[PDB]
Amino acid sequence: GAMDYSLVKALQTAQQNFVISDPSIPDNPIVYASQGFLTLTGYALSEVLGRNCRFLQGPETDPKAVEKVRKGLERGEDTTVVLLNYRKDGSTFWNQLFIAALRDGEGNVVNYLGVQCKVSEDYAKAFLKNEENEK
């Protein structure tokens, strides 16, 4: 299960926000979310489970950031982005996402792990300016 991964245990001991998805199920839904993620977003665990995490996006989310995530998942790459997300009540926050594939012995992706850090507007600006300059 989700909490059997050693890196998940490690993340828990530091009270990180994270989610685990299951890409063997159509549309790669969330199958575990940590307490910090639930508090940050305003959803109960049961409500999150079964949703693709794109449910945190909304009209002011930059589709270019979302496309970077999509392509990373498609190309088998680790990906790090900052993008605007939305809580259950519609309020917004900047979310720094760190996503990686969890693989079996043969390279098959068996789950994805995504860590989330709420970041300040100032930090998001500077991150995104750096990303842009570095393109």
| Distant-in-sequence, close-in-space partners of 62: CB < 8 Å, separation ≥ 6 | 83, 84
Q: How far is CA 41 from CA 4, 70, 132, in A?
A: 24, 21, 27
Q: Is 53 marked within a binding site?
A: yes
Mapped onto helix, strand or coil, the DSSP state of residue 120 is: coil
Decide: 24 and 112 in contact? Cβ < 8 Å. Answer: no
Q: Which is nearer to Cl ion, 110 or 126 (CB)?
A: 110
Task: Please give the residues from 56 up to 95 whose contact with ligand 5DD meets the rule CB under 6 A.
Answer: 56-57, 66, 69-70, 73, 83, 85, 95
Decide: 83 and 109 in contact? Cβ < 8 Å. Answer: no
Site string for ligand 5DD, 15-44 (x = CB under 6 A): ----x-x------x----------------
79 binds, among Mg ion, ligand 5DD, Cl ion, none (CB under 5 to 8 A by kind): none
Q: How far is CA 36 from CA 14, 42, 45, 61, in A?
A: 11, 10, 11, 21
Q: Is 46 marked within a binding site?
A: yes
Instruction: Cite the annotated binding site by residue number.
Output: 46, 49, 52-54, 57, 70, 85, 95, 116
- Residues in touch with ligand 5DD (CB under 6 A): 19, 21, 28, 52-54, 56-57, 66, 69-70, 73, 83, 85, 95, 97, 99, 112-114, 116
